Chains A and B, each alone.
Chain A
């Protein structure tokens, strides 16, 4: 009962969750699998972690697919030793990393009205900010009114 963790790097565009699972499950049995992705935009950092049930199987997989040329990409498949496998490494394993249109969200947010009494205490805050802008603008020498 010694699970083995392999790190794959230099991932070609498209060799994602499902292709990785199929390929390395055709090699063996995967406990968990996760490509790392960006929260702001649903794009991968071109690297992934696969925890196999069998450390030996993971070792042969790493040896056979370490220096592979796939779509102009030399892969990097290396077993990480069980000493530095961080306990909270497979946190988003096996789930779905969804793409969140944060820009549209902020935009719908800018269009949703509200009682702007709080936005008027906020315009008191922006009057103090343009006072800050004016005090940094005194070295410039530009005077502007409200």
Chain B
């Protein structure tokens, strides 16, 4: 699912700075000697939150490793409340490489070209089912509690030292 996401997304990646300068020079030279609206992956925490609140986002991907976590800790709930499909991706550096930055906390797809409307819709359906159903099964509960052999042995040591005779 991560690979499919980044395949539709890599087509809508932003323009690098060199490419943008080269394009601007191209129209400048043309005027020396009428375009459709660009479509790209929308990034930036505040911008993506605004798009989610205004229901312009079609898909949302949230990095799992943003510290501080408070920046994103409400994003899944906000996406669920607004009804936009959302998913959590391993690696803020990877969301970061789609844009041309070092780290992206969140990326979103708003609109795509006609050549990719069907692909984006199928990706939305696939991510929604195959991730949101499992997340609905286990998202409302507490995490943690992965005590191993040493931790559990320390636990029986503590209990057999505590509840036997004295406190």
* 8 A Cβ contacts from A54-74 to B: 66-69, 72, 74
Query: What DSSP secondary structure best describes chain A's contact surface?
Result: loop
B152 within 8 A of A: no
- Assess whether B125 is in contact with A74, with CB atoms less than 8 Å apart: yes
- Assess whether A72 is in contact with B130, with CB atoms less than 8 Å apart: no
Alpha-carbon gap, A145 to B122, bound state (A):
61
Query: What DSSP secondary structure best describes chain B's contact surface?
Result: helix
Instruction: Name the residue on A nearest B127 (C-beta).
Output: A69
Alpha-carbon gap, A68 to B125, bound state (A):
12
B113 to chain A minimum Cβ distance, whole angstroms, is 17
A77 to chain B minimum Cβ distance, whole angstroms, is 11
B1 within 8 A of A: yes
Alpha-carbon gap, A78 to B69, bound state (A):
37
| Total residue contacts A-B, CB cutoff 8 A | 19
Residues of B within 8 A of A72 (CB): 119, 122
* 8 A Cβ contacts from B75-130 to A: 119, 122-123, 125-126, 129-130
- A: number of interface residues (CB 8 Å): 6
B16 within 8 A of A: no
Q: How large is the interface on B (under 10, 10 to 19, 20 to 34, 35 or more residues)?
A: 10 to 19
Residues of B within 8 A of A69 (CB): 1, 4, 122-123, 126, 130
A74 to chain B minimum Cβ distance, whole angstroms, is 5
- Assess whether A67 is in contact with B119, with CB atoms less than 8 Å apart: no
B37 to chain A minimum Cβ distance, whole angstroms, is 26
Alpha-carbon gap, A107 to B108, bound state (A):
58
**Which listed residue (B4, B122, B123, B130) contacts A67, Cβ 8 A?**
B130
B103 to chain A minimum Cβ distance, whole angstroms, is 27
- Assess whether B119 is in contact with A74, with CB atoms less than 8 Å apart: no
B114 to chain A minimum Cβ distance, whole angstroms, is 16
Binding site for A on B (CB under 8 A): 1, 4, 119, 122-123, 125-126, 129-130, 133
Binding site for B on A (CB under 8 A): 66-69, 72, 74
The 4 closest A-B pairs by CB, nearest first: A67-B130, A69-B126, A74-B126, A69-B4
6 contacts between A and B (CB under 8 A): A69-B1, A69-B122, A72-B119, A74-B122, A74-B125, A74-B126
A69-B1, A69-B4 given; 17 more Cβ-contact pairs under 8 Å: A66-B130, A67-B126, A67-B129, A67-B130, A67-B133, A68-B130, A69-B122, A69-B123, A69-B126, A69-B130, A72-B119, A72-B122, A74-B122, A74-B125, A74-B126, A74-B129, A74-B130
